[PDB]
Design a protein around this ligand. Structure first.
Ligand SMILES: NCCCC[C@H](N)C(=O)NS(=O)(=O)OC[C@H]1O[C@@H](n2cnc3c(N)ncnc32)[C@H](O)[C@@H]1O
Ligand SMILES: NCCCC[C@H](N)C(=O)NS(=O)(=O)OC[C@H]1O[C@@H](n2cnc3c(N)ncnc32)[C@H](O)[C@@H]1O
Ligand SMILES: [Cl-]
Ligand code: NA
Lengths: 501, 497
């Protein structure tokens, strides 16, 4: 592009002519938002020639109306301000007027000094005496994201999206706001926020394939964590009673509209809670947060982008419960075989998948087949926030056996519009069973289940020191933002999402 | 261990007799802190047989004073309560008195139900009618805190040693204060990728991993710097991030392979602004935690000697090259990255018995000299300033000093806490300095970073004048909590073997 080349040449001409080249420090008098706050309500034509002020931002517009007069718009911290540069007011010690302004291009980061007020037409303005080129833009910028080459430019060059698209900036402010609300909710309950390792000698705490790496000096392989669950429960053994953690998990899996290989999760562990308590807390936290952002519990959503239809999500509590096995059997019209992990039920579930054209998982463990059946018959019923509850033990190796239902656990997942938001349970705190389920996990992994975890002996030893009855819970922060901010693509709520190619 | 095997045998006998086996839910009437608050003032010997309460904690002591009377201490949420179990009050529907209590051991997590009050001797007590085993402990616990056990079994350290719990509460309080400092300034907290196609932003060897679906090698981030600056190009003006970095390097008293760093980027700041902010932020936090700017520190552990660290402002500044030349009694050769000065710095390291770096780049030699001559003088919080450009590939050239940059490091007791600078925002130079890093890496420098074209393209869209800054949260907690081992401030630190 000839434009980038010429700009470099211009900057070389500036630097070798002794003129301002990338000044180190520009001292603004106030922000542009502060400027609009102080001066936005003056009368049209008002100017305070007794006050000199320095302002800075990115040039979004240049218009020379005459040989004597140049109009700029600059933008900074969500505020636009017009600069009126009149040759009569020009500080000639900064160079001749026409030379000073010939160095400026739309998109440049620049400073101005001048008198505050309002043009006779009512535009909030600075009547400038000087202009300083702080940081030039070397590329021709479009006017909006609509002028970009493709819309993947928004994700690969996020600075362009943030520069040109106010809706993108709003998303990441909302994301911060929601996380603040969430922290405050648990801080007020007396929780302690902790950090537990993202480098693990043994990965665990979820059904997910890990990233593998290696520590040279300790001569050992490590896994990026797929979940903090196993460390956090050890803190409850240690007596901290209420802990939470907000941070990244790493899952070496495919990317789609609701999966990024790193994502932000919150987990908390509350001694003496069970999953009934956790269901009530989930409803209270999420509906409070929805109310905080939206002013009611019925919020809009565009499932096919904003050129599509607009639906309503109703967060009114209490939310519907679906029982895992019962809702599958209602969809099938017959019962699963018992025990659920028998070879007989495994064969039956295979024949049910092929009957209902459900893509088989690999390998064909009972847990993975149950999950496929659930995704087909149950998760698709979850339009408004719904709990899917009481998952079979065989697919929940860390959830405590259900106090009433054989073969099930005290577990729930929260689903919104068929997408999973939360995973939670009464915690398994019995070491014999826990060891047994770890062995079954290790067996599945050895059979090719890349989402099954190895046995963690350190964790079994911790349970032998006595984990109090405890309730635990995990939430996908990014997926929460998708719903709060009305995005159907997770790449909209992560600043630098993973991209192919 | 016979004790562990025997406890498994007890729990099977319990399960097979239909007796309580890991109850799913125990509803406490109130917490032990709440119980202490409500009844801790009643007269001695007082008892309210009209009020029945349920309490739970971990058993810390069992005294079976007679066949009819058993005293327990339970502990939960930092509060101890005594349980007085008299056979005449026992709910025999839960088992005969002797059978119910034969199932409990020290260290078990248990619940009790009974009447509130105070023993005649004046101890806050529950006069219990029942006991329920909630989660047994299968191991004999010591009265008190190898001491490497504290780090490999952190739950035992927390269970038994209040000081360990105090540290991690202090850590939380400190991070809260820091978030609040920047939130009130209008900063926006952000999250940038920990998996990187290209590592950069620091001098460190990365961890290497691999994403199978995309068939691409990846690095874990050594720092978020390059992404965060892209956010200032995007116009967010004031951002910060608090999270893990990953560095594939040796562990010692101040290094863990993952650690918690805070970085922030402030449009229109330079490094003099950032020095003033560092002073205000840190001294205010020290004063908040300690009630003065002079605090104790034990460099050789708690039984060793105790010194005083003084955070009174303004803090000392040391100029990087000038202080080295003071220590040498002679001047470095110019330019500092010429082969002549590289050879001269090698001579100076041999003369002063400073171990040589590999490879022997100007930058790493300069670092070794500074480590010997300048970092050692930083007892109280001190800024080392104006690093040569050759060791500062992302820092903007000094407005006055040739070959130097507008950079500082904060040191405390000879340990690095902060690294900050006026950000380089001129793309031509930045490309040149990335090319020199790539050359160093190709010559064997495993801490030099490859060229990141996506960052250079970002700078061509115009990065405002900006000041940026990183802090090692863990190392800060070390001084605030008076620990000389980074393993004391990280819940699950990395361990050898
Ligand atoms: N002891 C109770 C269980 C706690 C949570 C458990 N350790 C766990 O990790 N569950 S999870 O369901 O695998 O992850 C929690 C949430 O993370 C979200 N998640 C999972 N994978 C991804 C990906 N790849 N991107 C984004 N969000 C994701 C989703 O909302 C899940 O409900
Ligand atoms: N643009 C301004 C520069 C910002 C910081 C820069 N990106 C950076 O990473 N500097 S750093 O010095 O490499 O890391 C910041 C701090 O992290 C701390 N640190 C570094 N390595 C470790 C390790 N290994 N463990 C613990 N703490 C560590 C130490 O306090 C450093 O001052
Ligand atoms: Cl002393
Ligand atoms: Na309700």
């Amino acid at each position: 592009s000839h434009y980038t080349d010429n700009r470099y040449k211009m900057m070389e001409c500036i630097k070798d002519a002794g003129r301002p080249f990338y000044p180190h420090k520009f001292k603004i008098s106030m922000s542009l938002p502060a400027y609009a706050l102080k001066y936005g309500n003056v009368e049209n034509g008002y100017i305070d020639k007794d006050t000199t002020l320095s302002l800075s931002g990115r040039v979004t517009s240049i218009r020379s109306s005459s040989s004597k007069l140049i109009f700029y718009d600059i933008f900074c911290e969500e505020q636009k301000v017009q600069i009126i540069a009149n040759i009569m007011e020009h500080d000639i010690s900064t160079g001749e007027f026409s030379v000073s302004h010939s160095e400026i291009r739309r998109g440049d980061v620049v400073g101005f000094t001048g008198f505050p007020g309002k043009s006779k037409r009512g535009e909030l303005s600075l009547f400038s005496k000087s202009v300083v080129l702080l940081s030039p833009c070397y590329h021709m910028l479009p006017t909006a994201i609509s002028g970009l080459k493709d819309q993947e430019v928004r994700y690969r060059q996020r600075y362009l999206d943030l520069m040109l698209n106010e809706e993108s900036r709003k998303v990441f402010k909302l994301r911060s706001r929601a996380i603040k609300y969430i922290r405050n909710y648990f801080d007020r309950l007396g929780f302690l926020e902790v950090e537990t390792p993202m480098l693990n000698m043994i990965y665990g705490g979820a059904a997910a394939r890990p990233f593998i790496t290696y520590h040279n000096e300790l001569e050992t392989q490590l896994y990026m964590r797929i979940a903090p669950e196993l460390y956090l429960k050890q803190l409850i053994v240690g007596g901290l009673d209420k802990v939470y953690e907000i941070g990244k998990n790493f899952r070496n899996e495919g990317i789609d509209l609701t999966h990024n290989p790193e994502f932000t999760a919150m987990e908390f562990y509350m001694a003496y809670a069970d999953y009934y308590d956790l269901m009530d807390l989930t409803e209270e936290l999420i509906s409070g947060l929805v109310l905080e952002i939206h002013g009611s519990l019925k919020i809009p959503y565009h499932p096919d982008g904003p050129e599509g239809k607009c639906i309503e999500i109703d967060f009114t509590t209490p939310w519907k419960r679906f029982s895992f096995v019962e809702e599958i059997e209602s969809g099938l019209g017959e019962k699963l075989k018992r025990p659920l992990d028998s070879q007989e039920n495994i064969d039956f579930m295979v024949e049910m998948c092929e009957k209902h054209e459900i893509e088989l998982p690999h390998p064909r463990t009972a847990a993975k087949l149950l999950d496929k059946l659930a995704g087909h018959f149950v998760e698709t019923k979850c339009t408004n926030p719904s709990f899917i509850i009481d998952h079979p033990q065989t697919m929940s190796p860390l959830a405590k056996w259900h106090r009433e239902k054989p073969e099930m656990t005290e577990r729930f997942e929260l689903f919104v519009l068929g997408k999973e938001l939360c995973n939670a349970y009464t915690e398994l705190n019995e070491p014999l069973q826990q060891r047994k389920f770890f062995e079954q996990q290790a067996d599945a992994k050895a059979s090719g289940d890349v989402e099954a975890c190895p046995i963690d002996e350190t964790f079994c030893l911790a349970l032998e020191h006595g984990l109090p009855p405890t309730g635990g819970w995990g939430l996908g922060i990014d997926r929460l933002i998708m719903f709060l901010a009305d995005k159907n693509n997770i790449k909209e709520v992560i600043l630098f999402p993973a991209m192919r190619n």
